[PDB]
Short mmCIF file of C-alpha atoms in Angstrom, two decimals:
data_model
loop_
_atom_site.label_atom_id
_atom_site.label_comp_id
_atom_site.label_asym_id
_atom_site.label_seq_id
_atom_site.Cartn_x
_atom_site.Cartn_y
_atom_site.Cartn_z
CA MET A 1 148.77 223.83 175.51
CA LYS A 2 145.47 222.74 176.40
CA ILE A 3 143.24 220.46 174.11
CA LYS A 4 139.77 221.65 173.80
CA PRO A 5 137.10 219.10 174.95
CA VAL A 6 135.71 216.36 172.53
CA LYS A 7 132.97 213.95 172.97
CA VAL A 8 134.18 210.48 173.92
CA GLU A 9 131.69 207.75 173.00
CA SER A 10 131.54 204.68 174.93
CA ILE A 11 132.70 201.65 172.82
CA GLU A 12 129.54 200.29 171.85
CA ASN A 13 128.90 196.06 171.93
CA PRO A 14 132.34 195.55 173.12
CA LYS A 15 131.90 192.28 173.33
CA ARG A 16 132.20 192.18 169.43
CA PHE A 17 136.01 192.70 170.10
CA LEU A 18 136.36 191.01 173.27
CA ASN A 19 135.12 187.80 171.98
CA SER A 20 137.67 187.09 169.13
CA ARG A 21 140.68 184.95 169.32
CA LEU A 22 143.75 186.74 169.91
CA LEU A 23 146.18 186.60 166.98
CA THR A 24 148.62 183.59 167.62
CA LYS A 25 152.65 183.72 166.86
CA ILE A 26 151.98 181.38 163.78
CA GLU A 27 149.54 183.26 162.85
CA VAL A 28 151.36 186.37 162.63
CA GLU A 29 154.52 184.46 161.41
CA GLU A 30 152.36 183.31 158.30
CA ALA A 31 150.89 186.52 157.48
CA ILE A 32 154.64 187.99 157.36
CA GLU A 33 155.83 185.17 155.33
CA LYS A 34 153.07 185.68 152.88
CA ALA A 35 153.79 189.28 152.54
CA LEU A 36 157.67 188.87 152.14
CA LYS A 37 156.85 186.64 149.16
CA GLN A 38 155.04 189.39 147.37
CA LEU A 39 157.78 191.92 148.41
CA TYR A 40 160.70 189.48 146.87
CA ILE A 41 158.62 189.11 143.91
CA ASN A 42 158.21 193.10 143.73
CA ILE A 43 161.93 193.60 144.39
CA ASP A 44 162.91 192.19 140.86
CA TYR A 45 159.94 194.30 139.20
CA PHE A 46 160.80 197.47 140.74
CA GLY A 47 164.64 197.24 140.79
CA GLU A 48 165.83 200.33 142.16
CA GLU A 49 162.60 202.34 141.19
CA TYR A 50 159.28 202.60 143.06
CA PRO A 51 155.57 201.90 143.11
CA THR A 52 152.89 204.23 142.26
CA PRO A 53 150.85 205.23 144.90
CA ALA A 54 148.00 202.77 144.25
CA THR A 55 147.92 199.53 141.87
CA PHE A 56 146.04 199.72 139.04
CA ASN A 57 143.47 197.00 138.62
CA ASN A 58 145.53 195.49 141.32
CA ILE A 59 149.18 195.85 139.91
CA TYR A 60 151.18 198.54 140.72
CA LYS A 61 153.08 200.50 138.13
CA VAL A 62 156.98 201.54 138.52
CA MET A 63 158.09 205.26 138.94
CA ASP A 64 161.00 207.28 140.03
CA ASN A 65 161.38 209.08 143.27
CA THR A 66 159.01 212.00 142.85
CA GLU A 67 155.91 211.17 144.49
CA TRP A 68 154.46 211.51 147.86
CA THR A 69 154.53 207.78 148.63
CA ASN A 70 157.92 206.46 147.83
CA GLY A 71 159.00 206.56 151.22
CA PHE A 72 156.49 203.68 152.00
CA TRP A 73 158.17 201.31 149.58
CA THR A 74 161.63 201.82 151.35
CA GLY A 75 159.49 201.10 154.72
CA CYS A 76 158.23 197.54 153.41
CA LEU A 77 161.90 196.72 152.91
CA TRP A 78 163.37 197.62 156.12
CA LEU A 79 160.29 196.00 158.10
CA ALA A 80 161.27 192.69 156.07
CA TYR A 81 164.66 193.43 156.74
CA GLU A 82 163.98 193.22 160.35
CA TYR A 83 162.14 190.25 160.40
CA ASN A 84 164.60 188.15 158.19
CA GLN A 85 168.08 189.95 158.71
CA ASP A 86 168.79 189.45 154.60
CA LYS A 87 171.24 191.85 153.68
CA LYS A 88 169.65 191.98 150.17
CA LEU A 89 166.92 193.85 151.31
CA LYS A 90 169.30 196.12 153.28
CA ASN A 91 171.22 196.99 150.31
CA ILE A 92 168.23 197.99 148.19
CA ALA A 93 166.54 200.05 150.74
CA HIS A 94 170.09 201.83 151.38
CA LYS A 95 170.16 202.59 147.49
CA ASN A 96 166.69 204.22 148.24
CA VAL A 97 168.08 206.19 150.86
CA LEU A 98 170.77 207.43 148.33
CA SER A 99 167.92 208.51 146.09
CA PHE A 100 166.05 210.12 149.14
CA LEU A 101 169.28 212.16 149.97
CA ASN A 102 169.70 213.32 146.46
CA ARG A 103 166.22 214.26 146.25
CA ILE A 104 166.26 216.55 149.34
CA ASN A 105 169.58 217.93 148.10
CA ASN A 106 168.12 219.08 144.91
CA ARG A 107 164.60 219.72 146.25
CA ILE A 108 163.11 217.53 143.57
CA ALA A 109 158.94 217.47 143.60
CA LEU A 110 158.76 218.19 147.27
CA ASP A 111 155.48 220.20 146.88
CA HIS A 112 153.70 220.43 150.12
CA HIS A 113 154.37 216.72 150.46
CA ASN A 114 154.34 215.39 154.13
CA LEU A 115 158.12 214.93 154.61
CA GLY A 116 157.54 212.52 157.52
CA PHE A 117 155.93 210.27 155.24
CA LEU A 118 159.13 210.33 152.69
CA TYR A 119 161.92 210.55 155.16
CA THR A 120 160.86 208.67 158.24
CA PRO A 121 160.14 204.97 156.98
CA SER A 122 162.85 205.29 154.24
CA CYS A 123 165.94 207.39 156.11
CA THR A 124 165.13 207.75 159.58
CA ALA A 125 164.36 203.90 159.40
CA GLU A 126 167.95 202.85 158.47
CA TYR A 127 169.53 205.27 161.04
CA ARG A 128 167.28 203.16 163.53
CA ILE A 129 168.64 200.13 162.12
CA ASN A 130 172.22 200.56 161.65
CA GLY A 131 173.30 204.13 162.36
CA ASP A 132 173.95 204.84 158.76
CA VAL A 133 175.26 208.73 158.56
CA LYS A 134 173.78 209.39 155.14
CA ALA A 135 170.41 208.27 156.27
CA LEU A 136 170.70 210.48 159.32
CA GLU A 137 172.07 213.46 157.00
CA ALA A 138 169.02 212.88 154.79
CA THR A 139 166.70 213.04 157.82
CA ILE A 140 167.89 216.11 159.29
CA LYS A 141 167.96 217.83 155.87
CA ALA A 142 164.03 217.20 155.33
CA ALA A 143 163.61 218.50 158.97
CA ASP A 144 165.22 221.58 158.06
CA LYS A 145 162.88 222.04 155.11
CA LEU A 146 160.17 221.28 157.18
CA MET A 147 161.39 223.95 159.55
CA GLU A 148 161.23 226.47 156.88
CA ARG A 149 157.73 225.04 156.14
CA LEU A 150 146.99 222.12 158.60
CA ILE A 151 146.18 218.83 157.80
CA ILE A 152 145.60 215.81 160.38
CA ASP A 153 148.34 213.75 158.93
CA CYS A 154 150.64 216.52 160.07
CA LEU A 155 150.27 214.52 163.24
CA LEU A 156 152.92 211.86 161.80
CA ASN A 157 154.96 214.71 159.65
CA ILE A 158 155.83 216.22 163.10
CA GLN A 159 157.58 213.19 164.26
CA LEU A 160 160.19 214.29 162.04
CA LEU A 161 160.69 217.34 163.90
CA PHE A 162 160.62 215.37 167.33
CA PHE A 163 163.64 213.42 165.79
CA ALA A 164 165.61 216.15 165.00
CA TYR A 165 165.27 217.63 168.40
CA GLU A 166 166.46 214.55 169.97
CA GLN A 167 169.31 214.56 167.35
CA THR A 168 170.51 218.14 167.69
CA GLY A 169 169.44 219.06 171.19
CA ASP A 170 168.11 222.09 169.45
CA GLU A 171 164.61 223.00 171.06
CA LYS A 172 163.13 224.93 168.25
CA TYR A 173 162.64 221.79 166.18
CA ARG A 174 160.80 220.42 169.26
CA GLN A 175 158.89 223.96 169.92
CA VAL A 176 157.64 223.69 166.39
CA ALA A 177 156.40 219.95 166.62
CA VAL A 178 154.54 220.79 170.05
CA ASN A 179 152.91 223.91 168.82
CA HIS A 180 151.80 222.20 165.57
CA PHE A 181 150.45 219.06 167.71
CA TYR A 182 148.02 221.64 169.48
CA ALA A 183 146.90 223.55 166.28
CA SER A 184 146.21 220.05 164.58
CA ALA A 185 144.41 218.74 167.46
CA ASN A 186 142.08 222.01 168.31
CA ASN A 187 141.49 222.95 164.55
CA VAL A 188 141.55 219.68 162.49
CA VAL A 189 139.46 217.28 165.07
CA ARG A 190 136.02 218.07 165.60
CA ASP A 191 134.28 218.35 168.94
CA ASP A 192 132.60 214.93 168.46
CA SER A 193 135.89 213.45 167.94
CA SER A 194 135.56 212.98 164.26
CA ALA A 195 138.61 214.22 162.09
CA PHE A 196 137.93 217.28 159.55
CA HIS A 197 139.28 218.47 156.28
CA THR A 198 141.86 220.87 155.86
CA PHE A 199 141.57 224.40 154.05
CA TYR A 200 140.48 223.75 150.30
CA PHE A 201 140.37 227.36 149.31
CA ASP A 202 142.62 230.65 150.03
CA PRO A 203 141.54 232.69 153.06
CA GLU A 204 142.13 235.93 151.02
CA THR A 205 140.56 235.20 147.75
CA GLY A 206 138.47 232.12 148.10
CA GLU A 207 140.70 230.63 145.08
CA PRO A 208 141.14 226.79 145.06
CA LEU A 209 143.96 225.87 146.54
CA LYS A 210 147.00 224.24 144.44
CA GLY A 211 147.70 220.55 145.12
CA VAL A 212 145.03 220.12 147.67
CA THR A 213 142.80 216.83 147.11
CA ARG A 214 139.11 216.57 148.38
CA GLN A 215 139.21 213.76 151.14
CA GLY A 216 136.25 212.48 152.57
CA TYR A 217 132.74 212.17 151.12
CA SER A 218 131.80 215.68 152.18
CA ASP A 219 131.94 218.16 154.60
CA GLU A 220 129.72 216.37 157.12
CA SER A 221 131.33 213.11 156.76
CA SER A 222 134.12 211.29 158.47
CA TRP A 223 136.88 210.13 155.95
CA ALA A 224 138.32 207.00 157.88
CA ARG A 225 141.87 207.51 157.01
CA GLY A 226 141.64 211.04 158.25
CA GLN A 227 140.22 209.37 161.42
CA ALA A 228 143.14 206.96 161.50
CA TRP A 229 145.85 209.62 160.98
CA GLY A 230 144.63 210.89 164.44
CA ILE A 231 144.53 207.64 166.02
CA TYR A 232 148.01 206.82 165.10
CA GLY A 233 149.31 210.45 164.91
CA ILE A 234 148.27 211.39 168.51
CA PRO A 235 149.86 208.41 170.54
CA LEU A 236 153.27 209.09 168.45
CA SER A 237 153.17 212.71 169.43
CA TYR A 238 152.20 211.39 173.33
CA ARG A 239 155.67 209.80 173.23
CA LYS A 240 157.47 212.70 173.06
CA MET A 241 155.05 215.16 174.99
CA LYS A 242 153.43 212.90 177.60
CA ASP A 243 150.16 215.20 178.10
CA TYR A 244 147.68 213.05 179.63
CA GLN A 245 144.92 215.03 177.50
CA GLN A 246 146.54 213.37 174.54
CA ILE A 247 145.23 210.01 175.72
CA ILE A 248 141.78 211.27 176.10
CA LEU A 249 141.76 212.77 172.76
CA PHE A 250 142.94 209.44 171.44
CA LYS A 251 140.13 207.53 173.21
CA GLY A 252 137.82 209.94 171.52
CA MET A 253 138.98 209.44 168.06
CA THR A 254 139.50 205.96 168.39
CA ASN A 255 136.28 205.24 169.83
CA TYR A 256 134.62 207.20 167.21
CA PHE A 257 136.24 204.95 164.64
CA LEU A 258 135.50 201.74 166.34
CA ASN A 259 132.03 202.78 166.72
CA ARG A 260 131.66 202.80 162.90
CA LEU A 261 133.41 199.53 162.03
CA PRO A 262 130.99 197.17 159.78
CA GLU A 263 130.68 193.28 160.79
CA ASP A 264 134.05 192.45 159.79
CA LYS A 265 135.83 195.32 161.36
CA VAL A 266 137.53 196.92 158.29
CA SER A 267 136.61 200.60 157.91
CA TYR A 268 134.71 201.71 154.83
CA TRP A 269 136.44 204.31 152.86
CA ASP A 270 134.03 206.97 154.97
CA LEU A 271 132.92 206.29 158.07
CA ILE A 272 129.56 207.24 157.25
CA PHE A 273 128.96 204.10 155.40
CA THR A 274 128.54 200.56 156.65
CA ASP A 275 127.41 197.24 155.93
CA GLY A 276 124.81 197.52 153.04
CA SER A 277 125.98 200.83 151.26
CA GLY A 278 127.87 199.10 148.12
CA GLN A 279 130.58 201.69 149.10
CA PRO A 280 134.56 200.63 148.76
CA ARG A 281 136.53 199.65 152.02
CA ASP A 282 139.58 201.74 152.88
CA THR A 283 141.85 198.63 154.25
CA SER A 284 144.97 201.13 154.58
CA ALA A 285 142.91 203.11 157.33
CA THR A 286 142.26 200.23 159.15
CA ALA A 287 145.89 199.14 159.07
CA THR A 288 146.71 202.55 160.32
CA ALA A 289 144.43 202.45 163.19
CA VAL A 290 146.10 198.92 164.31
CA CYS A 291 149.46 200.53 164.31
CA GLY A 292 148.12 203.75 166.55
CA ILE A 293 146.11 201.38 169.15
CA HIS A 294 149.25 199.03 169.44
CA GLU A 295 151.21 202.22 170.02
CA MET A 296 148.79 203.79 172.45
CA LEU A 297 148.61 200.42 174.49
CA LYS A 298 152.04 200.65 175.41
CA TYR A 299 151.40 203.71 177.76
CA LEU A 300 147.68 203.49 178.37
CA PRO A 301 147.23 202.63 182.43
CA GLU A 302 146.28 198.81 183.18
CA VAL A 303 143.37 200.64 185.10
CA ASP A 304 141.73 202.06 181.74
CA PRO A 305 138.66 200.37 181.69
CA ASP A 306 138.97 200.09 177.85
CA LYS A 307 142.43 199.16 177.63
CA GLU A 308 141.68 195.54 177.39
CA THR A 309 138.87 196.14 174.51
CA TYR A 310 141.50 198.21 172.64
CA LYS A 311 143.78 195.29 172.69
CA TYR A 312 141.39 192.96 171.30
CA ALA A 313 139.88 195.47 168.89
CA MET A 314 143.23 195.89 167.10
CA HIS A 315 143.46 191.98 167.02
CA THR A 316 140.15 191.68 165.68
CA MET A 317 140.79 194.46 162.98
CA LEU A 318 144.58 192.92 162.06
CA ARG A 319 142.85 189.44 161.88
CA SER A 320 140.26 190.62 159.38
CA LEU A 321 143.17 192.38 157.46
CA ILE A 322 144.97 189.12 157.27
CA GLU A 323 142.05 186.65 156.79
CA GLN A 324 139.92 188.62 154.11
CA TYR A 325 141.88 191.45 152.68
CA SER A 326 145.66 190.37 152.35
CA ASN A 327 146.72 189.48 148.59
CA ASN A 328 146.74 185.77 147.93
CA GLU A 329 147.92 186.14 144.14
CA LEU A 330 151.69 186.04 144.26
CA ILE A 331 152.23 187.88 141.01
CA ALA A 332 154.35 190.77 139.79
CA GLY A 333 153.21 194.04 140.92
CA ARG A 334 150.67 192.65 143.24
CA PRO A 335 150.26 194.86 146.69
CA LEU A 336 150.36 193.40 150.30
CA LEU A 337 146.85 194.53 151.03
CA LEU A 338 143.79 194.92 148.68
CA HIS A 339 140.61 197.17 148.82
CA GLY A 340 142.06 200.42 149.50
CA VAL A 341 140.67 204.02 148.58
CA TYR A 342 143.35 206.52 147.52
CA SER A 343 141.23 209.39 146.46
CA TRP A 344 137.43 208.76 145.82
CA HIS A 345 136.39 212.04 144.31
CA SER A 346 139.22 212.26 141.84
CA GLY A 347 138.76 208.47 141.21
CA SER A 348 142.13 207.39 141.73
CA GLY A 349 143.13 204.19 143.64
CA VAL A 350 139.40 203.47 144.21
CA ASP A 351 139.46 199.59 145.52
CA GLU A 352 143.16 199.55 144.66
CA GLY A 353 145.86 198.26 147.03
CA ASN A 354 147.82 201.43 148.11
CA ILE A 355 151.71 201.54 149.12
CA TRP A 356 151.02 203.47 152.56
CA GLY A 357 148.35 200.49 153.27
CA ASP A 358 151.03 197.86 152.54
CA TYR A 359 153.57 199.49 154.93
CA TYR A 360 150.76 199.91 157.70
CA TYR A 361 149.94 196.51 157.42
CA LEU A 362 153.28 195.15 157.57
CA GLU A 363 153.96 197.53 160.55
CA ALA A 364 151.22 195.95 162.23
CA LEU A 365 152.17 192.72 161.71
CA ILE A 366 155.83 193.20 162.59
CA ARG A 367 154.70 195.17 165.87
CA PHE A 368 152.64 192.13 166.60
CA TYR A 369 155.71 189.91 166.15
CA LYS A 370 158.78 191.58 167.76
CA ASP A 371 159.31 194.45 170.20
CA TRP A 372 160.09 196.79 167.37
CA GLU A 373 161.81 199.98 167.65
CA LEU A 374 160.13 202.75 165.97
CA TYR A 375 160.98 204.51 162.82
CA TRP A 376 158.73 207.19 163.81
#
């Protein structure tokens, strides 16, 4: 019930954020409209099926409901639906929900996949929006699967458990979520506020763990998306826990991230790289961090000397995403956002759009545009 001390860096050169122009309503509206043009085109391309995790030379392939990423496509549909109230979006996304209910009922391809990622933006999303009982059923069933049961994205995985607690009143859901927050905070964040890797090898035999992918350049580096899972997963958990130490841990992880952004404020795939490295960007890490900062700002005290800096930072990052990284070719299978990195070491989705990146980009847009009720 205590978070270990971490180093909180000062935000260096804060004027690089504070001198930016805030994103206007017209700017965000047009960014949304441009995204939805691509989404409506992709709707006829995927049908009742789903994009692959990442694009191939910037075009998604079509697949069934068997990856770790399928929920993020349904999430794009719900976000768009909240923008325009088009029942077509609702109809298609509810079909996805039905598919997710089937998938959890039959335990199809669940591996060790983050269940929050699969069920929150798809099923919990619909329950937020219209109270659909099947979406609720699918969500609780996934929470129960997670209960039977350390990576930093577990910070988003446990939001499923907080939802289950709220819906059931069963404190066991909450007890697990809270324990898992502190286990994650103390064991997968370094004392310098960098995120760190999970277990790659069996703790008894040293055997390579099955279905575990090396992320980040090295044991000594700072994987950008991992850092971002912290930046967003911490305030999400803070909503449900209200431990002020969580705000300090957020400032540590976020300042660490901001201080390693390059000139256009869009993270390289690993934070050890910046301008001149020749390394690919990971826009998805940046979109995720914008969402996390936006969320934390709902709670951060007015007297926090960095609050205004954070506000300008997320605007600076989102503006760069909209202006330099968002997709401009309205072609079947194109993503919302270019230049992400899925898995550098395995050579997958390197400098490709990815579906979680598209999701968090649209979520950031919707967050800025409206008072958005969280799926998480």
